[PDB]
Amino acid sequence: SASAVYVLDLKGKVLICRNYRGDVDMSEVEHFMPILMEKEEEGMLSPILAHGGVRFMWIKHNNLYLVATSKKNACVSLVFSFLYKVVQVFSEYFKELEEESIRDNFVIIYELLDELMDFGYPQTTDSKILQEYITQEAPRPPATVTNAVSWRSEGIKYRKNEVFLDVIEAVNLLVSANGNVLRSEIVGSIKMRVFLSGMPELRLGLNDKVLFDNTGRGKSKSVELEDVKFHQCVRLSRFENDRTISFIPPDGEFELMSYRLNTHVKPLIWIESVIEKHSHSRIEYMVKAKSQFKRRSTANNVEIHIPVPNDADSPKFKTTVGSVKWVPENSEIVWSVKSFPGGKEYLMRAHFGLPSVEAEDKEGKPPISVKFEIPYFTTSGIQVRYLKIIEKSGYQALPWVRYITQNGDYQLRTQ
């Protein structure tokens, strides 16, 4: 129950303001950045700032503090998911989100912040449905805003009827400093690109372990879905009954399902390293990179980052495969190898200098974090199986799919 949805600058003046209830006075926005500094410098950097009986919830985009005030007992995750959905809607309109937009596209953004919320309540937050009655180029509102099926306005027609599925692996990993796996989980996300005609219905075929166990085919290759969180479009009770993903799809880009399993198959890229940190002289990185997966796939454009001392100097990089640039902006090396086959080992040996006079504060030990990406390969073993198009017309659509293996936060610890 926000009382004023704010967008501030990085200083503390108002880019755009939109109050609803009168519970928070408009003068109360002026205290936000001093409270931010006075709570940030003492370890209490919290998303819920406090000013007497007036609270401050906020998220931080690149140049923007989407501040959301409240005075009573606000439902908090409501307001934060409201603010992230406002961020995603504005990124659907304005492909970048800066101060150049807000102080100049203020014709339409006040109307958006009138539409999204009344008396503190998020009510109509789909981007595509908000497009067809809020334009920057007005009729009656579409009934899709009022209708139960609220993410697909009827009357959409394309000449062909293409549906593109993108299955994205994102391996999260955190290997400890001894050489063992702490956590090998996989956050997978199926992102679909749907161009269909009318009001269709799709039923997705997965090789689920649970659906095969309800059928009687849990002895072939299947995926153990430890948890799945679907989009709003999937009728969840039909999934609760017999693992059935029934949904009226949206138009264009959307995220279908956000699953999260565990997998005790080996890590994809192994990073053994040593650090001979001689004091006040130099440092050595005899790091090796082997791949545990099969010898058929190729890892595109990997970026094996290794954090270095903050004030090192005169780098040398004797490699065998792949370029190095030393990036002192974040004080990191970026060991990049473009074409990376499976099962091979590429060795790299760096060598720096280090200052004589020691620093005032210590530097911290950030982790190695690689940025690999592999197509046509899944570590999970998940395969999509079927996708039925249901339509009163009845036609031949073309469901296309590809398999992407990426990283999530693929960190490996250092010494």
Partner: peptide, 13 residues
Amino acid sequence: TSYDYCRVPMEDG
């Protein structure tokens, strides 16, 4: 989209 697609079966009854 330089990674090229593959076609899945539609019905799989």
